[PDB]
Design a protein around this ligand. Sequence first.
Ligand code: MG
Ligand code: MG
Ligand code: MG
Ligand code: MG
Ligand code: MG
Ligand code: MG
Ligand code: MG
Ligand code: MG
Ligand code: MG
Ligand code: MG
Ligand code: MG
Ligand code: MG
Ligand code: MG
Ligand code: MG
Ligand code: MG
Ligand code: MG
Ligand code: MG
Ligand code: MG
Ligand code: MG
Ligand code: MG
Ligand code: MG
Ligand code: MG
Lengths: 67, 96, 217, 223, 60
Amino acid sequence: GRVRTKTVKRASKALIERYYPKLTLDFQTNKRLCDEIATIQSKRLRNKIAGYTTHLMKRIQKGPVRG
Amino acid sequence: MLMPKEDRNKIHQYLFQEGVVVAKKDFNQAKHEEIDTKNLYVIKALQSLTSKGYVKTQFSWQYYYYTLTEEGVEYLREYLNLPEXXXXXXXXXXXX
Amino acid sequence: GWVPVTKLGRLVKAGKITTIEEIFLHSLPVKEFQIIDTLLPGLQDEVMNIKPVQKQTRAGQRTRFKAVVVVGDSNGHVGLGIKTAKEVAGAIRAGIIIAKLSVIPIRRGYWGTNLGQPHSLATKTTGKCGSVTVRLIPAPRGSGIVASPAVKKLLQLAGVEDVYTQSNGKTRTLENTLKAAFVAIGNTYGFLTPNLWAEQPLPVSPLDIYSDEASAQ
Amino acid sequence: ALISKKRKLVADGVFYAELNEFFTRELAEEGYSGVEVRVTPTKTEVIIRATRTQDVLGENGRRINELTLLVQKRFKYAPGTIVLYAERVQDRGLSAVAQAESMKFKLLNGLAIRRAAYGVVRYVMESGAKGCEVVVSGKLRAARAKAMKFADGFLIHSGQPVNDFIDTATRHVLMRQGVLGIKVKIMRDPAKSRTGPKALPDAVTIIEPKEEEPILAPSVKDY
Amino acid sequence: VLKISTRKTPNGEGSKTWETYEMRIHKRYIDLEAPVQIVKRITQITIEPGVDVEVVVASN
RNA sequence: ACGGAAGGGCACCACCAGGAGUGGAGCCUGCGGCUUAAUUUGACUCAACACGGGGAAACUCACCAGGUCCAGACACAAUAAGGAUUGACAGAUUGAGAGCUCUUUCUUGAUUUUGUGGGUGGUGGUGCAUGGCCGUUCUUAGUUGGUGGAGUGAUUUGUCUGCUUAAUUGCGAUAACGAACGAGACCUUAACCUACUAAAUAGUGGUGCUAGCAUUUGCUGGUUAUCCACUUCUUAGAGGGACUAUCGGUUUCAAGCCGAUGGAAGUUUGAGGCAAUAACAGGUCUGUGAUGCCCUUAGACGUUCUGGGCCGCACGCGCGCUACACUGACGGAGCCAGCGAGUCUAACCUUGGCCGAGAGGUCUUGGUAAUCUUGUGAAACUCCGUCGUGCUGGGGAUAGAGCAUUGUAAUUAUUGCUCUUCAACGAGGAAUUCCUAGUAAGCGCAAGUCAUCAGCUUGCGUUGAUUACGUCCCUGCCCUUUGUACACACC
Ligand SMILES: [Mg+2]
Ligand SMILES: [Mg+2]
Ligand SMILES: [Mg+2]
Ligand SMILES: [Mg+2]
Ligand SMILES: [Mg+2]
Ligand SMILES: [Mg+2]
Ligand SMILES: [Mg+2]
Ligand SMILES: [Mg+2]
Ligand SMILES: [Mg+2]
Ligand SMILES: [Mg+2]
Ligand SMILES: [Mg+2]
Ligand SMILES: [Mg+2]
Ligand SMILES: [Mg+2]
Ligand SMILES: [Mg+2]
Ligand SMILES: [Mg+2]
Ligand SMILES: [Mg+2]
Ligand SMILES: [Mg+2]
Ligand SMILES: [Mg+2]
Ligand SMILES: [Mg+2]
Ligand SMILES: [Mg+2]
Ligand SMILES: [Mg+2]
Ligand SMILES: [Mg+2]
């Protein structure tokens, strides 16, 4: 199954907190934003982050998310 | 090792004219690469030698590396000629 | 350089606290071992033991070292530190740290005639670290510390000149004997003699006096 | 001449291994770490990295000359078309081989099992590494053989970066009774990588934003 | 892709596990048309360990 | 640690739903047993038995019957230039052009011989003295600090009820907070790219020159460069690409699971590489000029040479191969792969021409290779025809006779060919192995081995499904609960 790891989610929270205005609900733009404000050592990882970060946004923007 | 001296000469001439020996672990070879005597000779000619100093022995990938020490070249200056090589000088380059 | 992380250490780093009795008086804890470091240098340290313990892992075995350290000047202050770690050296160091954050005050007193500077104990005290109990009794001058080698070193660094020891229980488990020897002389400042009957008016604790110089970022 | 490229590059890789083995035997007492090899338009350059270059580049061209002539005879090089060079080292504390052989010699020079271990460990660690692990197997206190592990710092073991950052060396040490094994492992610092990635393939770094005092009320500047 | 496939084990005990090594040989060519100075310069100015180089005359 | 106790989970080396079989037959092949001059030897439940890359005619080669050789270094000491010592034609003698031994008599010169010391070798023992490597627990998910909490202490918590996941994977619950190893990331390989950079060792369109059917312009070929243009197909550099996207149903409306839409791709995208801590007297001294100790070292356990043996056959066992046919066999005919390999001081891949029923032969050729073999025209398969259920033309064992190839050497048949002999086998008892998508199964092919020999293995692609999309009933494991008089830990 598809469970995102700590290093992933750990990054998403970290990104979101200090970049909420800069980020959107769209995967591809966010994906790009990662190349600027973060230095990720591989593409799959970077997308995976960009993907979960975009996931939280799409529910953050529907009510405050626990952490 | 038995062997004649006219074969035992060329070995000791080569062991100083070049100062080092190719060797290779292969008995029954008949004739070295350079040295026109048995490869068995050259080996057991330099097994007596290193067993009494003079030259050092090194074995890797089925190849002895026969290197002549200090006390060696003095066993040569009595066994060959003069008193005044190879491993001492000669600087190549085609100079052209 | 030591960079304080507790309210206490700041006042100690700054110079707004100059002696340890200030802390014992206000019963403040102590969490940064540098506090007592500054407050009390030349505090000699003897390690008394290193026995190995063993464990059983989800497979075979697991073996590692245990250090017991006492620290003190020899003028009223002592510490006992038990630490066990993966190597000798580190198991020791940590012990010394843990011995110092442990450091305790001692009411030394006269056996009888108060002619010139205490030599034994205020009163009889006793402590018990599981089964082992050590008892300390005041003693004439010249009497010396009458204890087992390991209790004597402890009481030495505690700055004691003479005392009598009765000891009970399995005093072969070195760790427990000492911890009671410790609980013993630490209790000397609990025993309310009639000279402490006088009423004082309670100091106000350097935490409020130097409150500003105790505040952080 | 005239050899299949498939066979040549292999045949070459053979040569490297045959050289590297040799030089490890002869030049062990000089702290030999490794060699490069360079085919050039004429001249072939055998480059010897060793932490004791003088006992290699010997008595004014000697010693290394033996070592050249020992080569021209082996692989049938016409003299001069092959030339042995000499390097020092890139800090022996970071090379497993130079360390491996150090445990060998130290143990050979009679030293103590645990001391030899930690002393190597602490040299690597104080050579700016990220970690070090030295594992001695064999007969330590005789009879039934055991194995001891002396590690300090940080290691990984898993995927690719094991090949990037950590290099190991197993060396056979011949002892009074049997033999022991010397497996030194040295994980270097990705922070200094230079050639390759500068972090673990999962190190996420986030550049910190900036406090802002917004409003300012529109306005505009002209030039 | 050179392929060497053998058993991990020496002797012959244990599960029948296999390993497979590779050597990857990469090739390419570039064609030039240049004379006296540009020919001997370019063979040697462009040189690098591990990289086998070879230049060809022409015709047959 | 264990348990013939409890609760949870996970796993086609577990079962459910099934597929394919194996166990029955013959042959191949390994193991035992037996036999033998020897039938060398390792290994014995998963984790010994087409394993030791163990397909052995010499070799290998360790075993059996016999014959040589020193390559017994150096050092001390003794004989010896009234010659230490070496060699050999002949004959006798021997499998033998071994001068090994002997008959005669020449030779050759300090290099050898004798002895003690000391050494060199050994596929001789010891894997229960080791290393190195490897198998296994492990298709598993586990391991460990710092600071704080608990306990005299060993310890404990952190490392968890629940839910989630392939995962100590995560949400969360939280006397813990924050982290490192393992898992994940990572790497490889396979899928998409009309976007970039390119191409006579990759292709394509046009153009010359030329062939044929048609002739209404056309359709189909030939031409290694006729000449030009390009990069779709091929190759490989640089990047792009997916994140489980988007919507929807569930759920602490959390991790996540499910569905539908698109998408090259939505099972960790598929498949591998790597892989922590700790452990086992698991295998290997017969891989090693890796190695302790013992053993032996010139009537040698060293080495080499001649021949035999490892394959010897009342029988037990395992891996296989070929089959019982009509969804087939045989004969024609159609004709499509991918992974691969290949000759320098050498005889490897071999087209083509001729010869030969065949196997194979002979003269040439290209290729150190995206260039020559080779579009590796592979088999399954497809069409048409013959056979017509009969141990039949299914099946091809056993055996006779002959021709060729490898090799010094084919007998105890190396292999290949041709004719003839035409066995058991009519679906395989009790049992039992393997598997979830280009998979299973069927099909062959290259590569390892290799002088010759694959019924073995490592990979490759061709044809291509039924059944599941689950559970703990069986069998293993894992965590937790629990008992213990175990700790050399239920051998
Ligand atoms: Mg009692
Ligand atoms: Mg990791
Ligand atoms: Mg991994
Ligand atoms: Mg079933
Ligand atoms: Mg069957
Ligand atoms: Mg059968
Ligand atoms: Mg044989
Ligand atoms: Mg033989
Ligand atoms: Mg032998
Ligand atoms: Mg063992
Ligand atoms: Mg974890
Ligand atoms: Mg072209
Ligand atoms: Mg054309
Ligand atoms: Mg669809
Ligand atoms: Mg063997
Ligand atoms: Mg056999
Ligand atoms: Mg038939
Ligand atoms: Mg047919
Ligand atoms: Mg019939
Ligand atoms: Mg085989
Ligand atoms: Mg219990
Ligand atoms: Mg218990």
